[PDB]
Amino acid sequence: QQDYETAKHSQHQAKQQAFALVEIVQRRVHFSYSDSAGMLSENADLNDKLRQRLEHAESDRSRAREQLRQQQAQYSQFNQVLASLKSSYETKQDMLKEL
Amino acid sequence: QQDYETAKHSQHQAKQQAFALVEIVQRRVHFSYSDSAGMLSENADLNDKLRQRLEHAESDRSRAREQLRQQQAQYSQFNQVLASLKSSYETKQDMLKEL
Amino acid sequence: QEKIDRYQVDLEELSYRLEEQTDVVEEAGELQAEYEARTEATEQEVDELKSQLADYQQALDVQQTRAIQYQQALQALERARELCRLPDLSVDNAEEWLETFQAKEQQATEALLALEQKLSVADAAHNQFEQAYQLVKNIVGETSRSEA
Amino acid sequence: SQLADYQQALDVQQTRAIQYQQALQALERARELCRLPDLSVDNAEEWLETFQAKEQQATEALLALEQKLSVADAAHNQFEQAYQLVKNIVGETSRSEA
């Protein structure tokens, strides 16, 4: 029982640490607001910096677009090959039934 | 799990309200000069009409996104059935040529 | 011989099906390209409208003079006053409310974590229960838990 | 929208700056609570899965422990009955090994 309460506390430690890490993962984009923090500090016309950040985001967005396109192509390829295996196994099972 | 679900809801609401108060605290300084004032609405009319047109463009673009996504799906299933047919026919042809 | 004939018939039917499905799939692919082209066209129309609107508003909005700035503070205060059931909520007392709701929030997190610990042990218990059940089903097939 | 609605008047910028402050604070907090000054947003996912595994191992540990306690509700008599039965069937043995 003593070791059990000890383990409970250790579980609590793991829980808190994991919860923190999760929170940061949620705030993952917020760290991208360091530019927003710097941008806000301008306290004057800053549409130039806005446009710069926008261009950087556009580049990243297109990069992710290609990432997604190739990824979905790969996934679809795997899907067709899996389906081909499915159909082939069905057919083979059928010829086995017949024989 | 139901209990934890409710607890998570409560936690989210508390966190949101806390962030709202953090925002108030930050904007206390901006309230500090709440007396100031400035000009406004110099070019609203054409601006506003153009906002509305842009919004219509947004809505149509969202429509297009939806049709694109659903069409990608349908294409995917059609391709999968095509691949299944491919495997089936190929396996059957292999069986016949074997015989 | 007869078996070969049957399989030849089967191959004919499969060929017809493949032809038809290839037709449908080509139709679907060209429709997908169509809907892409249309969607990118709409995207570019939206981007054009946004960019040209930005161009038009350029000179309008640069000269803020930090004098329309505080209104954002006004809306934030009102949003909090609605979200937080504190009609008395004022920027002067907002700090006590901040610390108080932070205390409640961390308290809720701790209660949530205790709930999570108990939940995370009960769930794994259930998981071993279900894994045993699946093993039973695989080995013998359908049966109720009481039989497990 | 911000550039086309620069009338947004940096309110979103205010919120994002405040959010960055909170994110920095949270990163710090985790670095302490996890005692991982060696940490970054770009790899925090890795330590996150890592300590998800750790919390897992703890959870199954504690789960086995909970069942062990739940069965430990068993009185003393069962322990003696079982040990004597084992000692009869096999012969003298340590209770740690029975």
UniProtKB/TrEMBL annotation, chain C:
The signal peptide here is none
Q: Where in the cell is it found?
A: Cytoplasm, Nucleoid
Q: Which residues form a coiled coil?
A: 1-118
The protein's superkingdom reads Bacteria
The annotated subunit structure for this chain is:
Homodimerization via its hinge domain. Binds to DNA via its C-terminal region. Interacts, and probably forms a ternary complex, with MukE and MukF via its C-terminal region. The complex formation is stimulated by calcium or magnesium. Interacts with tubulin-related protein FtsZ.
Free-text note on domains in this protein's UniProt record:
The hinge domain, which separates the large intramolecular coiled coil regions, allows the homodimerization, forming a V-shaped homodimer.
What family does this belong to? Belongs to the SMC family. MukB subfamily.
What this chain does, per the record? Plays a central role in chromosome condensation, segregation and cell cycle progression. Functions as a homodimer, which is essential for chromosome partition. Involved in negative DNA supercoiling in vivo, and by this means organize and compact chromosomes. May achieve or facilitate chromosome segregation by condensation DNA from both sides of a centrally located replisome during cell division.
Q: What is this protein called?
A: Chromosome partition protein MukB
| Origin species | Photorhabdus thracensis
- Recall the taxonomic lineage recorded for the source organism: Bacteria, Pseudomonadati, Pseudomonadota, Gammaproteobacteria, Enterobacterales
